[PDB]
Amino acid sequence: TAIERADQLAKSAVAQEKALKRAEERAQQLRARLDAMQEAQDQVRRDSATH
Amino acid sequence: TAIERADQLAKSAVAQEKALKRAEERAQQLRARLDAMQEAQDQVRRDSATH
Amino acid sequence: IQAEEREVSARLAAAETALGESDARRQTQDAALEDNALEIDRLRNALLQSD
Amino acid sequence: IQAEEREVSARLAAAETALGESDARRQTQDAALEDNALEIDRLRNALLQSD
Numbered sequence: 619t620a621i622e623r624a625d626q627l628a629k630s631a632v633a634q635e636k637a638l639k640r641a642e643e644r645a646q647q648l649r650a651r652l653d654a655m656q657e658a659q660d661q662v663r664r665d666s667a668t669h
Numbered sequence: 670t671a672i673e674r675a676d677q678l679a680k681s682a683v684a685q686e687k688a689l690k691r692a693e694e695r696a697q698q699l700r701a702r703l704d705a706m707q708e709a710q711d712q713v714r715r716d717s718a719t720h
Numbered sequence: 721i722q723a724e725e726r727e728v729s730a731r732l733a734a735a736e737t738a739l740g741e742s743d744a745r746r747q748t749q750d751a752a753l754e755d756n757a758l759e760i761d762r763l764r765n766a767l768l769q770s771d
Numbered sequence: 772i773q774a775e776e777r778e779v780s781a782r783l784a785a786a787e788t789a790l791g792e793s794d795a796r797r798q799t800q801d802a803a804l805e806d807n808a809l810e811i812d813r814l815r816n817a818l819l820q821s822d
Contacts, residue, residue: 619815622759624675626752631678633748634685638692640740645696652703659706662713669720707726721772728779735786742793749800756807763814770821 620671620675624671624678627675627678627682629748629752631682631685633744634682634689637741637744638685638689640744641689641692641696644737645692645699648696648699648703652699652706655703655706655710659710659713662710662717666713666717666720669717721776725772725776725779728776728783732779732783732786735783735790739786739790739793742790742797745797746793749797749804753800753804753807756804756811759811760807760814763811763818767814767817767821770818
């Protein structure tokens with residue numbers, strides 16, 4: 619019984635690892651989009667200075 | 670040995686449960702920061718319109 | 721219409737997140753259920769032989 | 772922008788259908804997998820006694 623539980627729990631751990639990898643990749647995408655947005659804000663700030 | 674290894678993987682599974690939770694709140698927070706800079710851009714757009 | 725676009729795009733993005741997560745657990749649940757089905761059959765054979 | 776709103780709402784409708792279908796299928800196989808766990812416990816017990 620302990621071997622059965624250990625095997626299924628290791629499988630669950632592998633699934634959890636895959637889920638965190640997905641979440642971290644998509645959070646990285648969110649961070650990159652935020653960073654591009656900030657750079658755009660910078661350029662608009664330069665435009666405002668010109669005005 | 671089976672009981673020991675099963676307990677170790679139980680602890681690791683709990684740990685990555687906590688890590689997933691953490692990444693979830695932090696992704697929610699950084700999504701809120703995207704939102705905040707979104708309202709910032711709305712204000713700055715109407716500001717450039719006025720200028 | 722711009723505001724409605726923003727809110728719909730956001731909540732659709734959340735829906736895509738949820739569907740990806742649900743698809744991953746579709747896979748894990750179905751695979752684990754198939755493994756336990758194999759276990760059911762093998763214990764069927766074992767108990768038949770023993771009895 | 773009206774057409775783009777239509778497209779985004781269509782993607783949202785499809786996502787909301789797939790999410791519901793996934794959740795229902797998940798509930799069915801979740802109950803089935805719990806029942807499978809109990810039944811495997813029973814077979815392990817019968818193997819106990821007969822062995």
